[PDB]
Design a protein around this ligand. Sequence first.
Ligand SMILES: COCCOc1ccc(Br)cc1[N+](=O)[O-]
Lengths: 300, 237
Amino acid sequence: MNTVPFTSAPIEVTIGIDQYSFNVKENQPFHGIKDIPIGHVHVIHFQHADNSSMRYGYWFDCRMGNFYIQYDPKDGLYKMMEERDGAKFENIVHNFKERQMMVSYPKIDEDDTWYNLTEFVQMDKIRKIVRKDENQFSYVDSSMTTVQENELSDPAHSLNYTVINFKSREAIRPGHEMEDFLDKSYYLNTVMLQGIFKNSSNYFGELQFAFLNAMFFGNYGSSLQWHAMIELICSSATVPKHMLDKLDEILYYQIKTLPEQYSDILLNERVWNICLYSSFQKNSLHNTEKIMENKYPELL
Amino acid sequence: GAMNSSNYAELFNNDIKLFVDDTNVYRVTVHKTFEGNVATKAINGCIFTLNPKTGHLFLKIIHTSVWAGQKRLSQLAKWKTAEEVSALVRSLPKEEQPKQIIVTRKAMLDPLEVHMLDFPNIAIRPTELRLPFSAAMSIDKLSDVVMKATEPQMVLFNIYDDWLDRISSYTAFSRLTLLLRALKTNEESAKMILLSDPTITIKSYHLWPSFTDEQWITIESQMRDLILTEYGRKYNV
Ligand SMILES: COCCOc1ccc(Br)cc1[N+](=O)[O-]
């Protein structure tokens, strides 16, 4: 179990760690989050009390280094930083742990939610979508645009998700125009899986990361990517059986975790109705269809 | 974006453009089977591809053999339309290729966009105008070449005859759409109007009769009356 200490909390802020959140008051003696499960990526995230504009946060994996949070009064945000002195940091954690100035990652033993949401998410792949190679952790916020959004403006602050475009030469083989547009199997299986992602685990990892950025930061381009990656599978007549079964589990836990009150903005009616009711895979997502019908029947 | 009453003069500027109408591509007769079920029999069709400035018509005849052994023919017909339009563009010299293609039915947008991916600078546009190009098969010489075709064939016409020697493109297109709207609303009456006077003939190299300017005014007035009438005979007014 690992720890991210906090130097101080000088401004009032709602702090998230994965699917959990807690409010910290201005100058409250908060000094971090302990008992963080090893083996998964995590995200610590922030929304200031005075300006709910810009949710922002950091993806990290405690196996890769010792990370801590300190407020920068010049840039006006909580920043993640890596400490190389393993003794200086251990002294920081043990001292604050003795003073009980840390919240405990509040995982219920029965509860596999976070594993299920991050099963295929790897820090190494996050660091390629979010390019800042001098750090081992990755900053994301509400406003960051995707490479695809930019083509349609600062490159260094972009989300480099894999570009998916159903009306593109990449997606459509010359001479197979109608075939490839109505059945996206060659674009899914040859172009994307075999060519770009190499395997379904990396594809699902990017789909899962896009969803999490959509949910935790309201990142609109991430929501576009999540839906595009769903649609590309559902619109393919030929998908390996293991991928369809895994997709149903992935989406089930995403829909289960989504705040009920954000479905209006984070769920695209067209994609979901097409995916569950019209597409080739309309009968392959039983768990996802059942939760969607019972939790968001309005959208459908 | 969409072509409408507001940007109508754009049709007659000097940027090459083509209308594409697919409503006569897949044509069938519905009939009963010996067992009393219903079946369709395809007949030859055509793509109606028209330069509204110059009157040049690229009539691609769709022979019934293209449907043999195919499923979902009404969907396929849109993709076949887009395939043939793309092939026509590629066949034209660069300086003759259109800058815009306007489809008369919005369901042609995605098929045509996908087939034209190699031409990113050709705009594919819908229209809000309800154009009467379905009535093209009421023009006897066009219907005749489509029905007689024994294989796929492209036939080139000028749908304005020699009208552009005397009138502008705007006026020519207005006359064409009036004639076609009339043929669409009451084909029998329209054709009676066009041929009632046996001394006015259709030149071998033309589609419409050789009316003088004054006779065209009479003809055009007769077509308007027909359209308004039928509009009354329809809604009872
Ligand atoms: C430039 O000063 C860097 C001080 O480094 C720290 C500051 C605050 C906290 Br919480 C933890 C550390 N740490 O692990 O050393």
